[PDB]
Scaffold this active site. Structure first.
Site, PDB file in Angstrom:
ATOM      1  N   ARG A   1       3.577 -10.001  -1.939  1.00  6.14           N
ATOM      2  CA  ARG A   1       2.614  -9.294  -2.821  1.00  6.14           C
ATOM      3  C   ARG A   1       1.606  -8.463  -1.979  1.00  6.14           C
ATOM      4  O   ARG A   1       1.205  -7.383  -2.405  1.00  6.14           O
ATOM      5  CB  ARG A   1       1.881 -10.262  -3.767  1.00  6.14           C
ATOM      6  CG  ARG A   1       1.189  -9.595  -4.984  1.00  6.14           C
ATOM      7  CD  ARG A   1      -0.024 -10.414  -5.375  1.00  6.14           C
ATOM      8  NE  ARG A   1      -0.730  -9.887  -6.538  1.00  6.14           N
ATOM      9  CZ  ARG A   1      -1.928  -9.311  -6.494  1.00  6.14           C
ATOM     10  NH1 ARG A   1      -2.556  -9.153  -5.336  1.00  6.14           N
ATOM     11  NH2 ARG A   1      -2.504  -8.884  -7.606  1.00  6.14           N
ATOM     12  N   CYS A   2       1.258  -8.942  -0.772  1.00  2.71           N
ATOM     13  CA  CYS A   2       0.363  -8.280   0.168  1.00  2.71           C
ATOM     14  C   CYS A   2       0.997  -6.990   0.677  1.00  2.71           C
ATOM     15  O   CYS A   2       0.288  -6.029   0.939  1.00  2.71           O
ATOM     16  CB  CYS A   2       0.040  -9.225   1.322  1.00  2.71           C
ATOM     17  SG  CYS A   2      -1.710  -9.631   1.509  1.00  2.71           S
ATOM     18  N   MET A   3       2.334  -6.977   0.838  1.00  4.25           N
ATOM     19  CA  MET A   3       3.124  -5.864   1.377  1.00  4.25           C
ATOM     20  C   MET A   3       3.490  -4.814   0.300  1.00  4.25           C
ATOM     21  O   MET A   3       4.271  -3.894   0.556  1.00  4.25           O
ATOM     22  CB  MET A   3       4.415  -6.415   2.029  1.00  4.25           C
ATOM     23  CG  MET A   3       4.158  -7.305   3.214  1.00  4.25           C
ATOM     24  SD  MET A   3       5.605  -7.570   4.245  1.00  4.25           S
ATOM     25  CE  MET A   3       6.572  -8.714   3.207  1.00  4.25           C
TER      26      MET A   3
ATOM     27  N   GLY B   1       2.067 -11.965   2.590  1.00  5.98           N
ATOM     28  CA  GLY B   1       3.389 -12.134   2.002  1.00  5.98           C
ATOM     29  C   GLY B   1       3.868 -10.944   1.220  1.00  5.98           C
ATOM     30  O   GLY B   1       3.281  -9.858   1.340  1.00  5.98           O
TER      31      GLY B   1
END
Lengths: 408, 408
Positions: free
Chosen positions: A397-399, A395
């Site tokens: 935060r991962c990106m 999502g």
């Protein structure tokens, strides 16, 4: 001032590092999906529109959007550093055959523009792109012919900049990844934090090395406050990496007094701490309900130059409140009370919410139930379309990887 | 003169059967994407917008769009037929526990609107939706408590109306799906073709029945012309069902003289004939390249009420041209010359294209190379967004079931 300044997960985001999906997403094939850590094959054009919309939604909130490909390109400051990069990339590319490695070196050396070169190393190389090697020039591994279409595999997970390296205070944790598909990605961080005019030349202290034996990933590393760090002992992060990180932090006197170590290494289902636990406000966290049962938290301090551990057996919300200096902590349930909704939304990174200011979060439009709960708690949402980007199982935060955050 | 009139795959489409994704897509959970049939968990709201846009794109071409849930609702013509439906659905629902079966029967009997009832049977039932049964009323399977969240499993493939039944001439092949779980979906066709005011009452002859022993799926049934049928012998369709189908056609005198049987039962990678071969114009077909090599075609006729088989060992394009009455056939390869693109596009159903008129096809916008080849061959394309719907691993032909096409 310092180029890196990250002392929270909720402080007003000023600079963030992203990666715009390139041809590494186009070089995905169905038979090789499980290993390249992909659930489905995205449509590059739509993935790029979604990722541009995400970067623009951040810019609209006054955030400076930095790109991994740009920072890496700006690090090849001399022809010698450019050649050193090409050779290091090739040595880690797992090329089958000497003649194939030689042909690719010629190909990359011919790319004049540095960003074009960086982007090609990220995309990998198809065998169809290379000239036919005559039998006389072929070595042993060159003679073993396979139907496998790549000479160099792509790195499709690159747009998930959260994991290869994480910012801690004024320093960076250059990580050693679990998968050797994803450990190839840490080459860009290495060149940025050694040779970039702003981020290199020792201006950014290293609290972890990519050379290190034990594995750690950015998704396990949470900067809760200027005094407390949260790090998960998971399937991707070895407990030995956490102690080496703590010793390095107090060595480079970053200012972090305590580390809350979250044991869930036995839980294979959830890869990182951030997939089941993130901070969204001064006293609020998004959590996956299932993780409450089999969770063990440890207070790790570095006193008299030795490390001391205390298992915190009390209530999690009470523990977090005492450590943050707040009266009460609200643990918001991802997907609500319904098991099906919770499972569905967790899978779509419903608990992995990017906080761009206290109580201001960036979420996928698809996580309807979690978004409605966050809204009902008084939080402000910036909803983005992630139908193609969520195929990589990550999502907002991962990106992203914050480079600068306002102090709390 | 008959409610069903389908004598081609390319004749101008006048009526088509679709299914709008419902709560069956919401009832998907990561751990059971296995005991169901999905590659990813879609966002229902976006899935519904994409399908609606697809249905509207069809209406804009003068096609009457029929819905499976509506036709099934319109088949519950009496309270007795409504009760017979509820009881047949429950007997095939694989309910664990007598008391759970009883509670669900009460729940369904309470739904007064017939379409609301149909849609609920399609969605399945979560255990959380059911009242607490007192221990005294519980049987043994009721007492064995599991973490499994469904009392009745959803049917998430329902929006792929291509497989549970196929229209042939004026008749319907009500199929027996390879997996007994997918076979629950054929209950809606059974009620439609027996009790619907327009499609029931024997007005639509049956060339196949769901209570047949051998397996056959719609994706393995192609109506090439009023004289020729193309049927696949795949991993999902047993060769014995093809003979049963042919004998029933030639008996019900549906007018089809020959059947071209395509043997590729050994090819584990491609589920149906339609994922690797479809007709897009009078002399054009979209094909997967790999399939030409391992393909065996048989001419199956029913002369003197005894099946006669002739193996066709010649060129496929020449064979199709002789059978269609055209000079030359063009076999257009999916995803073109590049191996990576061909693999990528085959996966996104690039060889299975919906033809709504000769040379007029409905395609996913993501299949760039296949779409460019079709366009370069002079075809008219209607491009749709299918980012959520393709998670089910099916394209526009997979999501549609023609009820009426104009004669050629």
């Amino acid at each position: 001032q310092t180029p890196i300044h990250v002392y929270s997960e909720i402080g007003k985001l000023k600079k963030v590092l992203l990666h715009r999906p390139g041809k590494e997403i186009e070089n995905l094939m169905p038979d090789y999906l499980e290993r390249l850590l992909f659930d489905d094959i995205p449509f590059l054009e739509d993935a790029q529109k979604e990722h541009d919309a995400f970067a623009q939604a951040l810019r609209d909130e006054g955030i400076e959007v930095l790109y991994l490909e740009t920072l890496a390109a700006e690090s090849l400051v001399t022809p010698e550093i450019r050649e050193a990069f090409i050779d290091e990339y090739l040595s880690e590319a797992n090329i089958r055959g000497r003649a194939t490695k030689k042909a690719i070196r010629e190909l990359l050396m011919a790319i004049e523009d540095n960003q074009e070169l960086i982007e090609k190393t990220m995309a990998g190389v198809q065998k169809s792109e290379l000239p036919e090697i005559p039998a006389s020039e072929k070595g042993l591994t060159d003679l073993v012919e396979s139907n496998y279409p790549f000479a160099i595999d792509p790195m499709p997970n690159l747009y998930f900049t959260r994991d290869p390296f994480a910012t801690i205070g004024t320093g960076v944790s250059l990580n050693h990844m679990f998968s050797e598909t994803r450990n190839r990605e840490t080459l860009y961080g290495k060149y940025i934090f050694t040779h970039h005019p702003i981020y290199g030349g020792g201006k950014v202290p290293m609290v972890y090395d990519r050379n290190e034996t034990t594995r750690i990933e950015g998704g396990d590393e949470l900067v809760l406050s200027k005094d407390v760090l949260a790090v998960g002992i998971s399937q991707r992060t070895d407990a030995a990496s956490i102690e080496k990180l703590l010793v390095n932090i107090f060595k480079q006197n970053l200012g972090f007094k305590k580390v809350l170590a979250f044991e869930f290494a036995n839980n294979r289902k959830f890869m990182h701490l951030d997939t089941v636990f993130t901070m969204v406000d001064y006293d609020k966290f998004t959590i996956h309900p299932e993780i409450e049962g089999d969770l063990r938290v440890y207070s790790v301090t570095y006193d008299n130059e030795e490390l001391h551990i205390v298992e915190e057996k009390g209530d999690l919300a009470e523990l977090l409140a005492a450590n943050l200096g707040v009266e009460k902590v609200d643990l918001i349930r991802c997907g609500g009370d319904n098991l099906v909704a919770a499972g569905r939304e967790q899978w779509n990174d419903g608990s992995n919410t990017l906080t761009i200011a206290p109580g201001v979060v960036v979420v996928y439009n698809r996580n309807t139930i979690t978004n409605a709960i966050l809204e009902s708690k008084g939080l402000k949402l910036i909803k983005i379309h992630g139908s193609e980007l969520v195929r990589g199982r990550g999502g907002p935060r991962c990106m992203s990887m914050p480079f600068e955050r306002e102090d709390i």
